[PDB]
Amino acid sequence: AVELNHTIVLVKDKDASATFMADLLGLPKPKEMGPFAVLQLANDVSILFMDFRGEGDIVPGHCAFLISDEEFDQIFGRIREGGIEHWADCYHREPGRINDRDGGRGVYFEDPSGHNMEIMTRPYGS
């Protein structure tokens, strides 16, 4: 069975983005590994945050996280208490709302570099 083991996400500040995501998602502090700040997820995959060295701006990507119901209450609680801008939809046309797709709950937010981050409590499509 072929697993996705790690992927790189380019950001303006790897420590700022990795720590923001770890704190918000309720995960341990990211590990420093060479030029990477490592965010380890539960399903044997890690995001390697790396400082962008190019000249222009960050090309925003998309990472979506599947979490438990209790974790949604905790993470969305930190979104609300921290005044973090959030949206119910990927295109950010529904600000300040959460979605109820697939019988679960979901919400979108951004890391400091503007990547489109998402949490969800049920797999897409049921």
Pair of tokens at residue 73: 């209450």
Dihedral in degrees, nearest 10, Cα atoms 72, 74, 76, 81: 180
Mode of pairing for the β-strands spanning 36-41 and 62-66: unpaired
**Of residues 15-44, which lie at the interface with a copy of itself (CB under 8 A)?**
25-27, 41-44
**Of residues 62-91, which lie at the interface with a copy of itself (CB under 8 A)?**
62-68, 70-71
Judge contact between 98 and 79, C-beta under 8 A: no
Is 115 annotated as belonging to a binding site?
yes
Q: Which of 31, 45, 64, 77 binds Fe ion (CB under 5 A)?
A: 64
Angle at 73 between CA 98 and CA 104, to 5 degrees: 50
43 Cβ contact partners less than 8 Å away, ≥ 6 residues apart = none
Q: Which of 47, 88, 98, 107 binds a copy of itself (CB under 8 A)?
A: 47
Nearer Cβ to a copy of itself (21/88): 21
Q: Which of 23, 32, 96, 124 binds a copy of itself (CB under 8 A)?
A: 124
81 binds, among Fe ion, a copy of itself, none (CB under 5 to 8 A by kind): none
Distance between CA 88 and CA 1 in Å, rounded? 33
Q: Which residues bind a copy of itself (CB under 8 A)?
A: 1-8, 10, 25-27, 41-45, 47-48, 54, 59, 61-68, 70-71, 120, 123-124
